[PDB]
Write a protein that binds this ligand. Sequence first.
Ligand SMILES: N#Cc1cnn2c(Nc3ccc4c(c3)CC(=O)N4)cc(Cl)nc12
Ligand SMILES: N#Cc1cnn2c(Nc3ccc4c(c3)CC(=O)N4)cc(Cl)nc12
Ligand SMILES: [Cl-]
Ligand SMILES: [Cl-]
Lengths: 123, 123, 4, 4
Amino acid sequence: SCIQFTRHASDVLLNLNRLRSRDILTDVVIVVSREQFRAHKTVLMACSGLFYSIFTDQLKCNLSVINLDPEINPEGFCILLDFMYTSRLNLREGNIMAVMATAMYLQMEHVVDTCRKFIKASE
Amino acid sequence: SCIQFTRHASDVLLNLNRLRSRDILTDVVIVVSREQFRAHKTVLMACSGLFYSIFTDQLKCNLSVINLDPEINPEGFCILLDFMYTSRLNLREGNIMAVMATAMYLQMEHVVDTCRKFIKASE
Amino acid sequence: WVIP
Amino acid sequence: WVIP
Ligand SMILES: N#Cc1cnn2c(Nc3ccc4c(c3)CC(=O)N4)cc(Cl)nc12
Ligand SMILES: N#Cc1cnn2c(Nc3ccc4c(c3)CC(=O)N4)cc(Cl)nc12
Ligand SMILES: [Cl-]
Ligand SMILES: [Cl-]
């Protein structure tokens, strides 16, 4: 018999992104080659099969630094991290291959799906 | 020029609620009289003006335990904490006064609004 | 607010 | 996916 506030989930995500921008309560640095990205472990787990696996691990859950595979593109990661916190994906011709490869590695199935559909339309 | 995934914010919130149920990465206990509630500080701040103020405070941000005013009803808090993590509000005749008082204290304006409208319809 |  |  509950009532539901339609905009609540979007409002929560907007405030989690505000916390990220101000670097409040971030508890991990994701290292992608020469670049560093601060984030909240809980948001990363909620969006990515890879981070969900990493941060449920009894040893890795306590790490303050996570280094990604050297093949991972920093811009691709940046675009996906922005997507995690906003629901918006900056998908462009010049970045689509890097975004799709990063989304496959991060296990973000909905992003992989759309990247596949956008590439198929161009061939 | 971004594209947007409509269900993303709801999917994030569902996984944050799963983390809460499994007690993963919870970093605070909220004490309401004889009852204890584990939560994520980031979610509490994102939903409540009171917790936003508390956890941006340079001293209170590091506390593992927060005690609420003894006038706060544990059931009212439980209903609001469930709302924070799900967008669903279990608003009933028997709990509406406690929910509205708790929402005013927690500074959850949208919940206060609706409680006011539901009470006005019954008078 | 809606009836879900 | 939509055009926001
Ligand atoms: N507790 C918990 C919890 C926190 N996060 N999380 C999940 N995170 C996840 C796992 C796999 C995938 C994605 C997100 C996006 C995607 O494409 N795959 C799943 C579950 Cl079943 N549970 C949880
Ligand atoms: N950074 C950050 C950040 C984290 N959380 N948060 C806000 N949380 C909030 C503040 C006031 C109220 C509500 C939520 C619900 C309500 O009725 N009032 C606001 C801002 Cl402006 N910023 C942030
Ligand atoms: Cl995804
Ligand atoms: Cl609210």
